[PDB]
Amino acid sequence: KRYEKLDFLGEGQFATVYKARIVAIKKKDGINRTALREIKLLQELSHPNIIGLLDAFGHKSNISLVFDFMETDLEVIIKDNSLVLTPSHIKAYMLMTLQGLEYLHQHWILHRDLKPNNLLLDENGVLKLADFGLAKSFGSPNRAYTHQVVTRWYRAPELLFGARMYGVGVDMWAVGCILAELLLRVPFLPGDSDLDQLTRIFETLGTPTEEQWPDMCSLPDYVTFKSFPGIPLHHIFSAAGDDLLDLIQGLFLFNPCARITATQALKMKYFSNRPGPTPGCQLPRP
Amino acid sequence: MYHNSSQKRHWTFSSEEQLARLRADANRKFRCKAVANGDPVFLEPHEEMTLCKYYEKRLLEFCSVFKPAMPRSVVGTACMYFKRFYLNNSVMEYHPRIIMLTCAFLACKVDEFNVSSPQFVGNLRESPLGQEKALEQILEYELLLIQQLNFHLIVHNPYRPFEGFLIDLKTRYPILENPEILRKTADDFLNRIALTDAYLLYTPSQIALTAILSSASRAGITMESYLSESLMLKENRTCLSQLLDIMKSMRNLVKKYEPPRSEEVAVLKQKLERCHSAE
């Protein structure tokens, strides 16, 4: 329409992404429900740590969504062996993730696809939640959801046990998994199946009991597991200070109610303490 | 949320006069295209308005009998899409029979009410060929509808606000002993309000509260203390006056609402068909 079409960025299941003059354009059922989901939610959201939908248009049953052009994502940062992730860098990434998530959760929307590659960074080091193709409003009792959301490695145990209803805990668990990947530079819980995912969670964090998770056995795909002791968090995260271990502990609470919210996470001493989060312009670039 | 929504920003208008101007502009902008291409075949804005009221009623009928059961949220969204579409478009350019189905189709996707295309057009009382033709027309106009909505798809309905006030009245307003006795009449008034331009002129919260206080006034219950004491408008007396005037204005829209007459609709339908025969 008014877009130069410069460079190819990537392809997906539902859409293909191109750089255009600078913006990113993502090109009998009718218009794609994943495209409509992205349009309908991002039109109602305006926050510095949420990807901006600048414009939408197309022809027939094909639409082009226009977004801010993002330079990289956390996955590229994490996987880049050259760049060192200092505690200040980790805090900064987590802060922006949580500020975006606090805003999103305030507007009764779950992302449901949090992972380093859906945390896009611009040239100014502003992190934005992107890919709202699985994002969904929450806090309605009538609305029934699917448990297969969140890529397996970042999926919370309540999802892996078939939680139909859930809340911000599905994002916060993925935020813990991202934090764990920022600290280790490798996926925390790389499960090859829904059963291998639950195994790795319980072998690392301990098999939860009815004390730690009151109604775990009421979840429809609950399977009774071997009781593991779980590796103490200080043994996993050797370089993590006590404030960061308290954050990690709260993101990885088995009980999704007890699991810390974005606002609670943001109020934790980890974010208040020294050192302060790295300013956007000083964050590492691949 | 309504308070930072596209609905509030872009689709809540200052007055009926401002609506009538958008609709008048639509009617004369089509006339100027039709004359530029090529008589009393053209519909006047008041006739367009009668047909839109008639088709909005046909959209509600469609959504009411739709299997599987369409949530009220989807129906509200579809009806809002229909109203918004015909602010800036003539029924002489885009047939409201097609646009109303395309409204329902888009609303089902936006409100995450998962139905397949065939089970959607399965709800039409037409031959299999007719249903397949209907589907092709809906798919043709789905992008048109989204364009004319300016890609503002989330609609804030008064129904959740209505639930929030009932929780609040049950919790903080024991003077109203059982607030659930207001539900039926307040719902009846919400339906009537929906037939007007109210959805384009007031907030969903204002609409919901108007329905509740109207239902209270019919019951004989003088619950102005809820506004002053519970909602804390005794502090801000101008905010109270402003709120009472919105609700009076909204009660006045419903009183002066004329439904389309059968004999009038028949004549304008024939006139509408004649406009689409030639284009």
Next chain:
Amino acid sequence: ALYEYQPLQIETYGPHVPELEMLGRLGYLNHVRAASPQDLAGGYTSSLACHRALQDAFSGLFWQP
């Protein structure tokens, strides 16, 4: 350059909504349906529904175009 939590400043143009954690104490949850064990097990509480409904009731009640 240390971080300090500031709450999100979003004008609602309507009455004050009570905090999520206060809804139980203030008696709101007596008028919303109880979350089932399975709902609770996933982190869905009756407080979420109730809080969303009050926020929607109060959002823009005072706002004029």
